[PDB]
């Protein structure tokens, strides 16, 4: 049963904060083919080698895909410290993980283009005490708490957003800021792969 | 949203090797009521306290229920070495675990009684040589590889079962043996509670 990477090739890819994840188990994959459909600019892996994913059988493959400017290629990994790593997307690095940057070809009409690239500059929680900032750093494999108050596409750089937390939650406000980067002629997307050694039933496994 | 322990209170419970797992997420539970409907004969916990589960909140609650004789309560834990721990049911002991032994009251008509109590004396794998035996000890939170060849209720103690594994599986035969303990007047059942700490935590609280 071949792994279904169809959802990626159809639709406007989401922004980094609202990234889309496909979790594959009990399937066989051809990563060379998926990357054939795209123009790859960088493919750097941490606790795995791109070859070993294509030469070895593992329990699960997780592909998180999003629209990301190659202008910020350095910022995606935790090697570089900045807003994306702190408040937008974090892989469970230390586990076998790969980050790829790609430009969508003119041929790939199914992958549509966003109006602009957008990201969260900061997501923070101001407390009722006015003790103020308790910045909400992103958790790996999870979404920023500010995705509720941050628009799918940020209208303007420096846009600021707010939500009032319930008394039960502890009172206070959730505050966020947005930053925008202009869209390229061809969409530049970013792909995150996390492979898990797992125990038995090594199931994702090359073609 | 109350946790639904309803699947347990309706139907003939499975045998230990065929344990039924109910995973509860984003629900609230009162284990006092569930145990209230039964006559508890033991509530022993490791790495957790009966009452801490009732006083604190955890990411998930797993209850595994099965028909088990009180004759074998000593054997159920990893503390005692023997077939149930080796080839039938093993919990993640290092993780918080509770093992509960209870008798179904005459009032609980919905929990029906099996015709006898059954367990796997041995699950072993003869290899391609037709001599080598690799005993298939049960992994935790998983079923025996022999559940396919072992009957849901064993007709006679010492019954033997066989399956030929395909050449792709490494070849060989899968062999198993079964043991029978007579049914009591009132069904005696076994329950396994495993709770998990997590980033959210507030998923399975009490009350």
């Amino acid at each position, epitope marked *: 049963v071949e792994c279904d990477f169809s959802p990626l090739l159809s639709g406007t890819p989401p922004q980094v904060y609202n990234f889309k994840r496909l979790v594959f188990t009990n399937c066989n994959y051809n990563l060379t083919k998926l990357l054939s459909l795209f123009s790859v600019n960088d493919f750097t892996c941490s606790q795995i080698s791109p070859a070993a994913i294509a030469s070895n059988c593992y329990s699960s493959l997780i592909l998180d895909y999003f629209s990301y400017p190659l202008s910020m290629k350095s910022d995606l990994s*935790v090697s570089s410290a900045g807003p994306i790593s702190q408040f937008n997307y974090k892989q469970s690095f230390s586990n076998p993980t790969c980050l790829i940057l790609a430009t969508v070809p003119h041929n790939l009409t199914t992958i549509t283009k966003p109006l602009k690239y957008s990201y969260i500059n900061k997501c923070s929680r101001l407390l009722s005490d006015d003790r103020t900032e*308790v910045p909400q*750093l992103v958790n790996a494999n999870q979404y920023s708490p500010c995705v509720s108050i941050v628009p799918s596409t940020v209208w303007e750089d420096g846009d600021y957003y707010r939500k009032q937390l319930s008394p039960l939650e502890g009172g206070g406000w959730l505050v966020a800021s947005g930053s925008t980067v202009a869209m390229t002629e061809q969409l530049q997307m970013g792909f995150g792969i996390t492979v898990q050694y797992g125990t038995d039933t090594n199931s994702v496994c090359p073609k | 949203v109350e946790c639904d322990f309803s699947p347990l209170l309706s139907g003939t419970p499975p045998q230990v090797y065929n344990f039924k797992r109910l995973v509860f997420t984003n629900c609230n539970y009162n284990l006092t009521k569930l145990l209230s409907l039964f006559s508890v004969n033991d509530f022993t916990c490791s*790495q957790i306290s009966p009452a801490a589960i009732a006083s604190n909140c*955890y990411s998930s609650l797993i209850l595994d229920y099965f028909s088990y004789p009180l004759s074998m309560k000593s054997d159920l834990s990893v503390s005692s070495a023997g077939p149930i721990s080796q080839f039938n049911y093993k919990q993640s002991f290092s993780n918080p675990t509770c093992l509960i032994l209870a008798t179904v009251p005459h009032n609980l008509t919905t929990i029906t009684k099996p015709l006898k109590y059954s367990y796997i004396n041995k699950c072993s794998r003869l290899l391609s040589d037709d001599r080598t035996e690799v005993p298939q000890l049960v992994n935790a939170n998983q079923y025996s590889p022999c559940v396919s060849i072992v009957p849901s209720t064993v007709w006679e103690d010492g019954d033997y079962y066989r399956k030929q594994l395909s050449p792709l599986e490494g070849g060989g035969w899968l062999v198993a043996s079964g043991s029978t303990v007579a049914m009591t007047e009132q069904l005696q059942m076994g329950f396994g509670i495993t709770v998990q*700490y997590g980033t959210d*935590t507030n998923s399975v609280c009490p009350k």
Partner: nanobody
Amino acid sequence: QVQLQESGGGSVQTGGSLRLSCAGSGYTDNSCSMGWYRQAPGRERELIGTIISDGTTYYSDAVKGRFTISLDNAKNTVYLQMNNLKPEDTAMYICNTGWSQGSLVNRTTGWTRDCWSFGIWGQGTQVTVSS
């Protein structure tokens, strides 16, 4: 029972470096955010930074190049390294854990509390920097 205790405070001559401690009591594991703040007398509490277990840190942009935050997950202590300390830095340095997605747990007892609805504030330590 759960509390945080700061340490390493005292007197440093200007240009010096001090590393402070915020040990936590009553929790085997913390999945939450531990953060450092400074309050001068007559001045508001100002965020120094926030850290999580992975090593991810946020700096206030004024503590850039001088203040650093570290965490020891076992021995649950968060630390602040302050360098080129100057007289203006003299203030009370306090630490907080809480209000941050993850949970505080004691594996020995089975206790768990959600940091989103809970927070702990440390007593405080004073850094006096003199010429």
